[PDB]
Design a binder for this molecule. Structure first.
Ligand code: NA
Ligand code: NA
Ligand code: NA
Ligand code: NA
Lengths: 172, 172, 172, 172
């Protein structure tokens, strides 16, 4: 119906809406993590800062998807942003592992979206995904994997000194 | 249980958690409005910009509340961020009226929170609310009322020229 | 025959030549529009400026396609640039609607070109189209749709005041 | 009797004098801690610097209270500044825990002062306490709690390496 809509399948529109909700959910998870590390009984300031930055970045990814939805003449349908799985993330290492799992889940969703766009012969949508989301996800996954490896090698979560020093030296 | 907790009632902690969720919900409503005005069949760029700025400000208010929760030794319990009431906000004037209603609802919640903090003799929480939330809410309500008045006087929503010119001159 | 030619199908070469001609035709249409709004009995300077800028941009798109043709070892075959459909474009709103229709036609041609390049397994040509043409077209279509929406809402073409104010505030 | 005195109860004046003495005592405790960490057999320079800064800040808080006493027409009655409980503070972690306990005691005194001022309907005194003392105390308590948490997690006081690294990385 939109005067600008061209080569934009309804399935693609629906998938974009689902991706918007997933990105908002990921941002909310990161927010929860960030303020977990701000707790007085956790007190890892750079973990909190790292996850807060991640949250803001995820928010921006969601917003970019909404912008695309409008650009292509699709209609944004928002849904509830579900609360994260955990209130207490239990350690820096556990939070990093959960973030890695989350980023891989988002990446899988993006790959499914790219598959759909390819099936619908929507080169603009494919190129948008590749340009703005896929390599960002690969880099994020690599960085989180590096963090997890380093934390495990340093002796986290059992060694509190490990998480303290990782907070200072890697995230600081 | 928190080593930093002092003169922080459990009722106040719960009310702060509810306020956090309300602020996140308000931010989400503003986001929905912003991207409604970004639609090709609405195309009011400065309305979109205004509501996007409002959304970011609300997000920051929520985050400040979470920071307080941690500062006082309370524990943040996040909840689902419900989707906004509307997908289609129908006009600049209607969006402004809905935003006014929303801001007054948030203000009423903040006033109830202040009443609770006064009843619990929590001067720090009272002062926090007064310093960071109450006057901001009064100013926001006044600004939205001004916008609604001007839009109505110009002939919105029936006159599209009114909303166009208000977009340019007041929000631009 | 070209020493540089590699994985460049003759069908792709022919389609590129057709695209070159289409881009030149679009530039010529925009030129006609621009100088229509420069007429003393139309006198919408920023409409003229907008369409002149569009014309120059289209010319540059054509030239970029010719550069690609040479880069890949294809041979440029120019054809007559047909005159635009209209000498008199009748209004700012009508010109914007015609420009929207034209941009969607160019976009459809580009999508067909991308389909051909995908069928011929020419990833370089696909990537060229995606990187330099597809998102530019989506943005142009969105912008024109916004202009059309705003002009219609303001009361164009009947209200001359609408086109005057749109000339000043949006295109100025 | 003072020409400037207005709505300043004698009970409030006495409580302000007691608060002045408490702030001076806290400054003296911090001074003792600071020079404990300057000992050659302790030798934690940034612990010493941190506690010296805390001492100076407490002194300034006391002085601000005296200024208020004069502003409101009360009369300053100084009392002996009692020596701190300990000469030897035994470790960085123990000093931080004692500082946390001290700050919470000062905060409790300030809250009692605010309760008194509210009971006497002295909004100026209430606002003074809220503006200059309450949030400062909350922040100080939160910071000390964070320090205590980090020191405990790193393995202090048993691990001298923990206190050394905390000295360098957090307090440095
Ligand atoms: Na993302
Ligand atoms: Na708010
Ligand atoms: Na073009
Ligand atoms: Na003090």
């Amino acid at each position: 119906t939109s005067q600008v809509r061209q080569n934009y399948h309804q399935d693609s529109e629906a998938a974009i809406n689902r991706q918007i909700n997933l990105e908002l959910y990921a941002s909310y998870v990161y927010l929860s993590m960030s303020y977990y590390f701000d707790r007085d009984d956790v007190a890892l300031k750079n973990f909190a800062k790292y996850f807060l930055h991640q949250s803001h970045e995820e928010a921006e990814h969601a917003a970019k998807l909404m912008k695309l939805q409008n650009q292509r003449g699709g209609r944004i349908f928002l849904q509830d942003i579900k609360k994260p799985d955990c209130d207490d993330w239990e350690s820096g290492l556990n939070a990093m592992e959960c973030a890695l799992h989350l980023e891989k889940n988002v990446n899988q969703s993006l790959l499914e979206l790219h598959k759909l766009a390819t099936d619908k012969n929507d080169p603009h949508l494919c190129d948008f995904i590749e340009t703005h989301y896929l390599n960002e996800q690969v880099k994020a996954i690599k960085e989180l994997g590096d963090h997890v490896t380093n934390l495990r090698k340093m002796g986290a979560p059992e060694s509190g000194l490990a998480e303290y020093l990782f907070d200072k030296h890697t995230l600081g």
